[PDB]
Amino acid sequence: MKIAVDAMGGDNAPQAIVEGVMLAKQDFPDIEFQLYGKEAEIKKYITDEKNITIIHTDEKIASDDEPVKAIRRKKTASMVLAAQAVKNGEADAIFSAGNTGALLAAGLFIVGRIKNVERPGLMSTLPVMGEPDKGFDMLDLGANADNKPEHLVQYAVLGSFYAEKVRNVQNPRVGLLNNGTGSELTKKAFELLAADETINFVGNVEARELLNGVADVVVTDGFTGNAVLKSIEGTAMNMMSLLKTAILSGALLLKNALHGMKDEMDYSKHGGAVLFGLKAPVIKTHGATGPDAVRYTIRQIHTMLETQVVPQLVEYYE
Amino acid sequence: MKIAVDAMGGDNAPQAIVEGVMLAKQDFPDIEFQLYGKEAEIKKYITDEKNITIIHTDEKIAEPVKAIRRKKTASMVLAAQAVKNGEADAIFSAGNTGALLAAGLFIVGRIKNVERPGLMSTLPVMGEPDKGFDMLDLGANADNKPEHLVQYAVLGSFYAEKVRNVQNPRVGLLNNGTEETKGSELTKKAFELLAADETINFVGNVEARELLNGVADVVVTDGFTGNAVLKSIEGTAMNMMSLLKTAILSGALLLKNALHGMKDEMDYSKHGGAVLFGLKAPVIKTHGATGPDAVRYTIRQIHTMLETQVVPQLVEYY
């Protein structure tokens, strides 16, 4: 087991990335990590050198170079090197808390997509209210800005594989995000999904209930998925802000309420966003990650590697 | 000024609808109301008979379009028909959204040269109870063209400027990022069209995470995305509220004040119902769970639309 790590991506990188690896080393004593970045800045945070190699580079993907030209031209950016390592068979998986668009490009043009999957999907395990050991997979969360009916069908297939093999959800319920109990897209996707007996399709799901466990896998196009996810996050943060302001004004019940709301909404506990439908595990850790979300990303990677979920996808399609 | 009222639509109808009209008659003693529905039910809640006509029918809408061209006697259709016939200036209903959408489109009719009417609501801005932002389409349509979003920007600007007194209203395009480039096929072309239109204060791309924070006065989107965004916001807000409600019911006062303040920030029906906008007369959808308050705010909104002549100014424009 070997993981290539973009050490330079993230608001708190390289510190948060390295420290998150330090913690994950304790979870997983035999994983070897390759840390791609400027070694001087990385070394400052290394606490134990075992199963660590540093690959030095002074290049990193900028805020903001355009993603496909940066991937094709900045050949030594830390993220590019990490992805190339995976492509080469030098590593088994890559994660970055860096720019999402760049990682998508690296995923498409360096890691490669599984043949017969035209459009990989950005997928996260999201919150089920009251259920800390449950979640639901939703995709596409933003790999694509346009989708066709056939993409959403393969999202159901991809999402089900992950929910079942990685999260142990047997015969997972697949719902289609729609505008009632739809568009030309969702109309056609519904018909294809209802016709496939190998998918446990549960019909249309409503955005109002997404956080209440209506399906194990929710399928949508990348534009709607992006807008829904960020709508959920923006509303949650705005509700939490209201509490913070009252707290910053008996106060203990209110601090506990805020803490509990943060916990319910803390879905990076389940890992990062999988760029799923690619030839190896590639994860987008959220950009404001500290060490914990890095550590949860590595746990998710460990599970994907140990369950061989990507190689099974490959033999399924390829 | 005559308003046609669907007395039968809504959870709490007709109690809540007539109680709403009773209050509105005190705000506006010279508006005449026609209350469509069965009179034995309607009369029970009349508390002053001045300026109230009842049009009896025992039929009410339980398929939208089919049930509209068929049930010529249903309370909603009669009310919608009356404004068509020129017997009433405006119509509202707390009944089914689809049927009111059908009734608005097919009976009231669209302003000529507006392609698709857009469902529009003034939505919250955090910390600012005298401010809002108009968003459309929130679900009249499940598919849209780039040119429809240009119209939505104009319609929204007229409403924000003439009805809500917002000068030179900022128009934002809901998009998947801030860059011009950046977007689905629909939003790439809409961005270009909106930036060329000299009628509008186009402010560029707005992101869904920040919608509640006053980033624009008018936010423009397709009906599928707008429905998903709106319902995502509501579903998230209600879930946060449930977390507080469970804490309360288990310093308890600081919690119920927090819950109450949260409900107040999200209580956007105080600005009126959802406008079926781009139609030939004011037609508004009052929320299904309405009491007398949201009916009364609906009446105030139509009073303002009529007084400001917003529909006439949109005909002129087109």
UniProtKB/Swiss-Prot annotation, chain A:
It is an enzyme of class 2 (transferase). Its EC number is 2.3.1.274. It catalyses: a fatty acyl-[ACP] + phosphate = an acyl phosphate + holo-[ACP]. Pathway: Lipid metabolism; phospholipid metabolism. It is found in: Cytoplasm. GO terms for biological process: fatty acid biosynthetic process; phospholipid biosynthetic process. One of its GO terms (cellular component) is cytoplasm. Gene3D superfamilies: Isopropylmalate Dehydrogenase (3.40.718.10). GO terms for molecular function: phosphate:acyl-[acyl carrier protein] acyltransferase activity. Keywords: Cytoplasm, Lipid biosynthesis, Lipid metabolism, Phospholipid biosynthesis, Phospholipid metabolism, Transferase. The keyword Cytoplasm applies. The keyword Lipid biosynthesis applies. Catalyzes the reversible formation of acyl-phosphate (acyl-PO(4)) from acyl-[acyl-carrier-protein] (acyl-ACP). This enzyme utilizes acyl-ACP as fatty acyl donor, but not acyl-CoA. Homodimer. Probably interacts with PlsY. Belongs to the PlsX family. This is Phosphate acyltransferase. It comes from Enterococcus faecalis (strain ATCC 700802 / V583).
